[PDB]
Amino acid sequence: KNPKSDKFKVKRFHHIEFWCGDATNVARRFSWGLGMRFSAKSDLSTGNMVHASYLLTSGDLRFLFTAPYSPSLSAGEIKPTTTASIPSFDHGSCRSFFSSHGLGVRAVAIEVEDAESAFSISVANGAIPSSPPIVLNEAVTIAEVKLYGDVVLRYVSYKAEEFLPGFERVEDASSFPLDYGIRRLDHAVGNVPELGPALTYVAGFTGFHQFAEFESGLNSAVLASNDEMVLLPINEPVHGTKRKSQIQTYLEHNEGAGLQHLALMSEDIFRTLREMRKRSSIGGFDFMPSPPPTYYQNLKKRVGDVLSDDQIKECEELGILVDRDDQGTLLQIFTKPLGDRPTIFIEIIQRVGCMMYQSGGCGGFGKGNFSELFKSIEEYEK
Amino acid sequence: KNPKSDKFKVKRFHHIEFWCGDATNVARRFSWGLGMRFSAKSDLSTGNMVHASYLLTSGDLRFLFTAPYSPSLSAGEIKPTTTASIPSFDHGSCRSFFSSHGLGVRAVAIEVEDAESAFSISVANGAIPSSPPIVLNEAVTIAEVKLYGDVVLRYVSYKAEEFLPGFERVEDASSFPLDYGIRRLDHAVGNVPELGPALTYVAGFTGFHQFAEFESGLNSAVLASNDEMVLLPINEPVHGTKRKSQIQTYLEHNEGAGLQHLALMSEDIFRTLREMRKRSSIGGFDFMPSPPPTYYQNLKKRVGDVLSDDQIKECEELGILVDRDDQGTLLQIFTKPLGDRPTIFIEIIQRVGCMMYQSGGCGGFGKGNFSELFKSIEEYEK
Numbered sequence: 001k002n003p004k005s006d007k008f009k010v011k012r013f014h015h016i017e018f019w020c021g022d023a024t025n026v027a028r029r030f031s032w033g034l035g036m037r038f039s040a041k042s043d044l045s046t047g048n049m050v051h052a053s054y055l056l057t058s059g060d061l062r063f064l065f066t067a068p069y070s071p072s073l074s075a076g077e078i079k080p081t082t083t084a085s086i087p088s089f090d091h092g093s094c095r096s097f098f099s100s101h102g103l104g105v106r107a108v109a110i111e112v113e114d115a116e117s118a119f120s121i122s123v124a125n126g127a128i129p130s131s132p133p134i135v136l137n138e139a140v141t142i143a144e145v146k147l148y149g150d151v152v153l154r155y156v157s158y159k160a161e162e163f164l165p166g167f168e169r170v171e172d173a174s175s176f177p178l179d180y181g182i183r184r185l186d187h188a189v190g191n192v193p194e195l196g197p198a199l200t201y202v203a204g205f206t207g208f209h210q211f212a213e214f215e216s217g218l219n220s221a222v223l224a225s226n227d228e229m230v231l232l233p234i235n236e237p238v239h240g241t242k243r244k245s246q247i248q249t250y251l252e253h254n255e256g257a258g259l260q261h262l263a264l265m266s267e268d269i270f271r272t273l274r275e276m277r278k279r280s281s282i283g284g285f286d287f288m289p290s291p292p293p294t295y296y297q298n299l300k301k302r303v304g305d306v307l308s309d310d311q312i313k314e315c316e317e318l319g320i321l322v323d324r325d326d327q328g329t330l331l332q333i334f335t336k337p338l339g340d341r342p343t344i345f346i347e348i349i350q351r352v353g354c355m356m357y358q359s360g361g362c363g364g365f366g367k368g369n370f371s372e373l374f375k376s377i378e379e380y381e382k
Numbered sequence: 383k384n385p386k387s388d389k390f391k392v393k394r395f396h397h398i399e400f401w402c403g404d405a406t407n408v409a410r411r412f413s414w415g416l417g418m419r420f421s422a423k424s425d426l427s428t429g430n431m432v433h434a435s436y437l438l439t440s441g442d443l444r445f446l447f448t449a450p451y452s453p454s455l456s457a458g459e460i461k462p463t464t465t466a467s468i469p470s471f472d473h474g475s476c477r478s479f480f481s482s483h484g485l486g487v488r489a490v491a492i493e494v495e496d497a498e499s500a501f502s503i504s505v506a507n508g509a510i511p512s513s514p515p516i517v518l519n520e521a522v523t524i525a526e527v528k529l530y531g532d533v534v535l536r537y538v539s540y541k542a543e544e545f546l547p548g549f550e551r552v553e554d555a556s557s558f559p560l561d562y563g564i565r566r567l568d569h570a571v572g573n574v575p576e577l578g579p580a581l582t583y584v585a586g587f588t589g590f591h592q593f594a595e596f597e598s599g600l601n602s603a604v605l606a607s608n609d610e611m612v613l614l615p616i617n618e619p620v621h622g623t624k625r626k627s628q629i630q631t632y633l634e635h636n637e638g639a640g641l642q643h644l645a646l647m648s649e650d651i652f653r654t655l656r657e658m659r660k661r662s663s664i665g666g667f668d669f670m671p672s673p674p675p676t677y678y679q680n681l682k683k684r685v686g687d688v689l690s691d692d693q694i695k696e697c698e699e700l701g702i703l704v705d706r707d708d709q710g711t712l713l714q715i716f717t718k719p720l721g722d723r724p725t726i727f728i729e730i731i732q733r734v735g736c737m738m739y740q741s742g743g744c745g746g747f748g749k750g751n752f753s754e755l756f757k758s759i760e761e762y763e764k
C-alpha cells in the first residue's frame with residue numbers, strides 16, 4: 001500500500017555531505033577506498049575563504065566533504081558579501097558538529113522541483129527550519145530543515161532542465177577515473193532514541209509513507225517518497241537485551257541521534273567488493289567479519305533459484321549477505337565504521353528483481369539476515 | 383664550529399604526532415600516500431576511552447595520528463585513573479589545537495637518556511613546561527615543553543636498552559607491508575613571526591647550537607644537537623617583498639606559529655618519488671610544480687661530478703631539486719600541503735657525501751635552490 005502522499009514533488013537523492021575537520025584527507029581516503037572520482041571543488045583556489053568542499057562522484061552517487069577554514073580569513077565578510085559557496089555553512093555549527101559527533105553526515109540532500117516550496121510546505125507541516133531558501137546565481141535553490149540530531153534534510157532545485165554555483169570542475173590530471181561499480185545512493189539510515197516521535201515528525205512534514213516490510217536490538221521503519229526512490233529508514237534501540245544494542249552504542253559514541261549508515265547500490269557487487277577488499281589494508285575500508293560457512297551452505301535452500309552455485313561461492317569468498325522478501329532478492333555487506341568512532345558505516349547493496357526500470361526497495365533491507373546469522377552461528381558451532 | 387653544548391643527552395628523533403579530528407582517515411591516507419605500515423594502536427579496542435592513536439612506521443620514521451573521543455566516554459575518570467595511553471593528552475587542548483590550526487603537528491618527539499632530567503634542565507633554563515615527566519608502566523618516561531606556537535618538544539626516555547605502554551602491535555592482516563623507501567626523519571622546521579626570540583628560547587633551554595649554512599621571503603637558522611642528528615630549522619617572514627612571503631601566508635592560515643614541514647630521508651629518492659607520484663591522484667600526495675628544463679640543463683655544471691646524465695634525467699622526470707654545499711649534495715622535493723590549509727607540507731630528501739655513517743645535514747637544506755629556481759625560470763622564458 002502506497003498512498004503517494006508526498007507534500008511536494010521529490011525526485012532523487014542528490015548528494016550526501018560529510019562535515020570534517022580536514023576535508024582533503026577524508027576525501028582522498030574515501031576516493032581510493034570506494035572508487036570515486038574527484039569531480040568538483042570549492043575552496044581557497046576558487047575564491048572560497050570560508051570552507052573547503054570537495055565532491056566525489058561514482059555514477060549518480062555524490063559525496064561532498066566540507067571543513068571550515070580559520071574564521072579570520074573571512075572575518076570581514078557578511079552574509080550579503082560571503083565567499084562561501086554553500087550559504088548555509090556556519091563555522092561554529094561545523095566545529096560544534098565535528099567536536100560533538102566526530103566525522104559524519106551533516107546533510108542528506110534530495111533534489112526537488114521547487115526548494116522554496118518544499119521548505120515552506122515542510123515548515124508549515126512541522127519541520128524545524130535550519131537554513132531558509134537561498135537562490136544561488138539565479139540558477140539553483142537550496143534550503144535545509146532538521147531531520148534528526150544535527151543532521152539536516154537539504155532541498156535542492158534547479159531551474160535548468162555543474163554541482164552548485166561557485167564550484168569548479170576538477171582538472172583531469174588531478175581527476176583519476178576510479179570506478180569500482182558504485183552507481184547511486186539507495187537509502188540513508190538514522191539512529192534515534194525514540195522511533196515513534198522521529199517518524200511522526202519526518203512523515204509529518206514530508207508526506208513520506210511507511211514502506212512495507214517483509215532480539216536484534218532495534219526497532220525500525222522506513223519512510224519513502226511517492227515512487228519509493230528516496231528511502232529513509234530510522235532505528236531505535238531495544239533495551240534490556242542480553243547483547244547490548246548497537247543502536248544504543250551508536251547513540252552513546254555519537255552523542256545522540258544521527259546518520260547510521262549509507263547504502264550504496266552497485267551495478268556489480270562482486271566487482272565492487274573485490275576492488276574494495278583489495279584496498280582494505282592499503283588505505284581503503286574494512287568489512288565486518290564474514291558469516292560462517294553454514295550461512296553459505298544454507299544459501300542453497302533460500303535463493304538457489306536466484307543465484308547459481310558459482311554465484312553463491314562468490315558470495316562466500318567476499319562475505320556477501322543475501323536476503324529476500326516476496327518481491328525480490330538483496331545482496332549486501334557492511335563496512336566497519338568509516339572513522340574513529342563506532343558510529344557511521346557504509347552498506348554496499350545490489351537488488352535483483354522487481355522489473356517493470358527496477359522498483360524501489362526491491363528485496364527489502366535485509367532484516368532477515370539478523371535471525372539467519374544467529375542460526376548459522378550456532379549451526380556452525382556444531 | 384660545533385661547541386657540543388647540549389644541556390642533556392639527546393639521541394635521535396623518536397616520533398612526530400599529528401593532532402587530528404579523525405585519526406583513522408588521516409592515518410589511512412598517509413599510509414598509502416607515503417608507504418608507511420600500520421604498526422601500533424591505542425584506541426577503544428585497547429581500552430583507551432580518551433583518544434584514538436594510530437602509529438605508522440617506515441624504517442625508523444614514526445608518525446602518530448591522534449584524535450579525541452567524546453569526553454563523555456571518560457567523564458568518570460581522573461588523571462590517576464585515566465585510560466589514555468598518552469597522559470599529556472587533553473580533550474580541550476586537542477580540539478582547540480585542531481580548530482585553531484587544522485591538521486598539523488602537535489609534538490616533535492626526541493629520544494633522550496633521561497626525560498625527567500631533560501625536562502628539569504630545560505625548565506631550569508627557560509623552557510615553558512607543557513606536561514611534567516610521567517613514568518609509564520615503570521618503563522618509559524615522557525615529558526613535554528613548549529617549542530613554538532602550540533607545538534611541543536616531547537622528551538621520551540626508555541629504561542630498557544613497544545612504542546609506548548598501552549599501545550598494541552597491529553594484526554598483520556591489518557598491517558600491509560608498504561614501503562616506498564622512506565627511512566627516517568631528517569629535520570623538522572618551524573615558522574614563527576620573529577626568528578631571533580624563537581632561537582634564543584629554544585637554544586636557551588636545549589643547548590642546541592647553530593648549524594653552519596652554505597629575496598626568498600624568509601630568514602632562517604638551524605639548531606642542532608651535539609652530533610647534529612636532531613635538526614630544528616626555524617623560519618621568519620621577510621616583509622615588504624614583491625612576492626608575498628610564504629612564511630607570512632603560513633602564519634595567517636595557521637593562526638600563528640607552528641610546524642611548517644617535515645623532511646623525510648629516503649634511501650632511494652628515485653624509488654620514493656616514483657611510488658609517491660603514481661599515487662598522487664589516487665589518494666596520495668601531490669608535489670609542487672616542477673622546475674623548467676633549463677634548471678635541469680644547468681644541473682650539468684653544478685653537480686655533473688656527482689650524478690650521471692642518466693641520474694640527472696631521472697631528476698628531471700620526477701621534478702627533483704638538487705643543491706650542494708662545500709661538504710655534500712642534496713636531492714629534495716616538496717609536496718603540496720598535506721591538508722586543507724596552505725600550511726604544513728612534506729619534504730623528501732636524500733643526502734650524498736660526508737661519509738666518516740653519514741654526518742648530519744650533509745649538503746645543507748637547499749637554500750641555494752631559491753636563487754637557482756629564479757634563474758632557471760627567467761632563463762627558460764628566453
Ligand SMILES: CCOC(=O)c1nc2ccc(C(=O)C3=C(O)CCCC3=O)c(C)c2c(=O)n1-c1ccccc1
Binds near residue numbers: 187220221367373374
Ligand atoms: C550478526 C551481524 O549481522 C547482522 O545481523 C546485521 N544485519 C543487518 C541487516 C540489515 C541492516 C540494514 O541495512 C538496516 C536498514 O537498512 C533498515 C532498518 C533496519 C536495518 O538494520 C543492518 C544495518 C544490519 C546490521 O547492521 N547487522 C549487524 C552487523 C554487525 C554488527 C551488528 C549488526
Ligand SMILES: CCOC(=O)c1nc2ccc(C(=O)C3=C(O)CCCC3=O)c(C)c2c(=O)n1-c1ccccc1
Binds near residue numbers: 571617
Ligand atoms: C620557487 C619555489 O621553490 C623554492 O624556491 C623553495 N626552495 C626551498 C628550499 C629549501 C627549503 C627547506 O627545506 C628549508 C629548510 O629545510 C631550512 C630553512 C630554510 C628552508 O626553506 C624549502 C622549504 C624551500 C621551499 O619551500 N621552496 C618553495 C617551494 C614552493 C613555493 C615557495 C617556496
Ligand SMILES: [Co+2]
Binds near residue numbers: 187263
Ligand atoms: Co541498509
Ligand SMILES: [Co+2]
Binds near residue numbers: 643645729747
Ligand atoms: Co627542509
